[PDB]
């Protein structure tokens, strides 16, 4: 019903992300800053030395098995349309290394999906029972990149002293150091995606312009055909529900719900 | 005959292809460097990227009014509706330009965003007769248009002072504090091929977009007049270059007002 914003991203995405409310009188969310890429407040010494990148020397479109970046990904998982292959392990996704600016290939090679940004037509909307949510305005085939989980990159020490923990995405411990993305104060459309026990999205760790393994980027891919109008959802995991289960129960409505 | 030796030296990284041609000799497309479309580093530079340190505007319009904070930092917004520098822009002593950024309240299509939109002109790398490779425009370029950025490897002054090849350095001079340099010898974009001209049709301008760390301005070339289709691009290398290289060769820009021949 009520169109309360024509584009919450104010033109920073390749297509607008409108916001509508047909439930109550809440206006468009405004208690955060929309950013389309990750940001920092305190410094994160991400390794950006260009000579530290692994890269490929392909002269084709990076469809051969000799592509170093495909080999780092165990294989290039992207088909001719940029969708994950049917055999992609959705239960335990691998890391994806996309091609980068040190590679000899062209900017339009096969192994570049997440770095081309959001393409699906999404919409922020007011749900009946769990606040704001995100839905697709179009059919999304299986294995399509939907959106990235974008926010403020913070250390574990910083996360342990933040009053609000509902917008944290853990980049769990590759070593002693561990970091997370906090979308509470800075974030993109993904900060409004609700939990579902049978999720139509799965997060995948991706490396594009750097390969600092402490700082993967979080890309959501569809696990099935998402029909037009369907709400997006992913599995928040057990750390969330072991903390928030004390306060409320899951309202995903799935007959296979595990937290209600 | 004009040999096409590359369809795009940028391999698709620019909005427009930049082909390379050679009607002079049998030299192939230059390949002794790595093309990058934006600045890179090898040793860390600790650029201040704290989002709360950005100055930003709160404009409710397209940032075309007098109240835009980012225009005020630039002493005024110098861009017209087409993204070109106003005729009042001081080409002889350009001010610092602060474009709008992701902390501003405005939209991504506001007026104060030109260099962050990337290269737009149709350019061409080509073999000259007595200057090696050069860059020309394939189209008319109106005055005050953003043409290309000087892109390369960001290095410190002490690193530059131990590099054997100095012909691709762009100085980021600092009146106070540490001084840095862009070296396009090993990593660079199309701008590393632009030759010196004593009456140049390009002027470099220091611009800030995603960060405002004054140690690291980005270098944007704007046209100083109409550049016609076919014309070679050129800017003034300055005195530090010619005080060093003038001992080896004379300027061949061919201008009637050449100052280094
Ligand atoms: C509530 O759900 C989480 C809560 C916490 C999480 C992650 C959580 O959900 C992750 C998935 C759900 N997301 C929702 C949107 C996107 C995915 N992560 C951290 C990190 C764990 C490992 C890496 C370093 C810190 C621990 N702290 C947590 N809450 C504490 C914070 C500090 N105190 C008080 C001082 C307020 C209370 C408890
Ligand atoms: C030859 O032209 C330059 C030469 C030098 C420059 C700048 C120059 O031209 C700038 C304009 C021309 N460009 C051409 C393309 C784009 C603009 N910069 C400096 C400093 C760098 C950072 C601190 C302030 C200035 C260093 N010295 C330089 N050559 C020395 C380097 C070390 N070797 C040996 C010790 C190995 C001795 C010569
Ligand atoms: N499946 C679910 N059941 C109940 N509440 C949920 C839920 N999924 C998400 N939420 C709510 O949404 C928060 C995650 S942030 C997701 C956006 C949120 N709906 C908003 O309006 O800002 C959780 O803290 C929880 O309060
Ligand atoms: N006006 C000029 N007169 C003589 N040589 C010039 C010149 N402008 C540029 N050059 C040459 O080009 C170098 C700058 S790098 C510019 C690209 C270069 N022509 C190339 O083929 O790689 C200078 O060191 C000088 O060798
Ligand atoms: Zn490859
Ligand atoms: Zn590659
Ligand atoms: Zn590739
Ligand atoms: Zn559930
Ligand atoms: Zn403004
Ligand atoms: Zn602004
Ligand atoms: Zn603006
Ligand atoms: Zn001259």
DSSP notation for A84-152:
BPTT--SSSPPPEE---TTSSS-TT-SS-SGGG---S-EEEEE-SSSSEEEEESS-B-TT-EEEEE-EE
Two tokens at B39?
């600045």
DSSP B165-198: --TTEEEE--SSS--EEEEEEEEE-GGGGPEE-S
May I ask the CATH architecture of the domain B1-261?
Beta Complex (2.170)
Interface contact B46-A48, CB threshold 8 A: no
Two tokens at A52?
């530290």
Contacts of A35 in chain B (CB under 8 A): 51, 102
| In contact, B44 and A49? CB cutoff 8 Å | yes
Interface contact B51-A43, CB threshold 8 A: no
Rounded Cα distance, A146 and A167, in Å:
19
Interface contact A41-B34, CB threshold 8 A: no
Rounded Cα distance, B25 and B23, in Å:
6
Rounded Cα distance, A20 and A123, in Å:
8
Burial B163-172 (b: 16+ CB within 10 A, else e): eeeeebbbeb
Ramachandran area for residue A74 (φ above 0: left; ψ -120 to 50: alpha; else beta): left
| Documented resolution in Å | 1.9
Strand partners, A92: none
Whole-number Cα distances in Å, A215 to A53, A60, A78, A107: 14, 29, 22, 23
- What counts of helices (H) and strands (E) characterise chain A? 3, 14
Report whether CATH 1.10.10.60 matches the domain A1-260.
Answer: no
User: Experimental technique used?
Assistant: X-ray
Going by C-alpha positions, the residue among B210, B195, B15, B201 that lies closest to residue B119 is B15
Judged by a CB distance cut-off of 8 A, whether residue B109 touches chain A is yes
Residue A13 neighbours by CB under 8 Å, 6+ apart:
A7, A36, A117, A118, A189
| In contact, A198 and A260? CB cutoff 8 Å | no
- Taking CA–CA distances from A209, the nearest residue in chain B reads B40
Helix (H, G, I), strand (E, B) or coil at A244: helix
Strands A179-187 and A33-34: parallel
Helix (H, G, I), strand (E, B) or coil at B243: helix
Contacts of A101 in chain B (CB under 8 A): 13, 36-38, 40
- The shortest CB-CB distance from A11 to any of B46, B51, B109 is to B109
- Tell me which residue has its CA closest to atom 26 in ligand 4: B131
- Taking CA–CA distances from B49, the nearest residue in chain A reads A40
Whole-number Cα distances in Å, A218 to A73, A96, A201, A210, B225: 15, 10, 12, 14, 46
Rounded Cα distance, B75 and B98, in Å:
9
Run of H or E including A239: helix A238-244
- Testing the interface with B: which of A8, A9, A11 to mutate, by most B Cβ within 10 A? A11
Strand partners, B232: B136
Interface contact A50-B43, CB threshold 8 A: no
Maximum pairwise Cα distance, chain B: 57
| In contact, A123 and A137? CB cutoff 8 Å | yes
């Amino acid at each position: 019903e009520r169109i309360v914003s024509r584009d919450i991203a104010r033109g920073y995405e390749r297509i607008p992300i409108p916001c509508v409310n047909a439930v109550d009188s809440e206006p468009c969310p405004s208690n955060y800053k929309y950013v389309s890429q990750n940001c920092v407040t305190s410094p994160m010494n991400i390794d950006r030395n260009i000579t530290h990148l692994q890269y490929c020397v392909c002269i084709d479109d990076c469809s051969s098995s000799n592509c170093m970046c495909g080999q780092l990904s165990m294989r290039c998982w992207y088909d001719k349309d940029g969708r994950l292959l049917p055999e992609f392990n959705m239960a335990e996704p691998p890391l994806i290394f996309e091609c980068n600016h040190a590679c000899s290939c062209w900017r339009n090679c096969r192994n570049r999906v997440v770095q081309n940004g959001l393409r699906a037509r999404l919409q922020l909307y007011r749900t009946r029972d769990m606040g704001w949510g995100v839905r697709s305005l179009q059919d999304i085939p299986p294995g399509t990149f939907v959106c990235e989980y974008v926010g403020e990159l913070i250390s574990d020490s910083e996360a342990d002293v933040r009053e609000e923990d509902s917008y944290l995405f853990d980049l769990d411990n590759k070593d002693g150091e561990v970091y997370c993305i906090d979308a509470r104060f800075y974030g993109n459309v993904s900060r409004f995606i609700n939990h579902h026990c049978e999720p139509n999205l799965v997060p995948v760790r991706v490396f594009m312009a750097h390969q600092d393994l402490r700082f993967p980027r979080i890309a959501f891919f569809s696990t099935r055909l998402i029909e037009a109008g369907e709400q997006l959802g992913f599995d928040y995991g057990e750390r969330f529900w072991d903390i928030k289960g004390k306060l409320f129960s899951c309202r995903c409505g799935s007959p296979k719900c595990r937290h209600s």
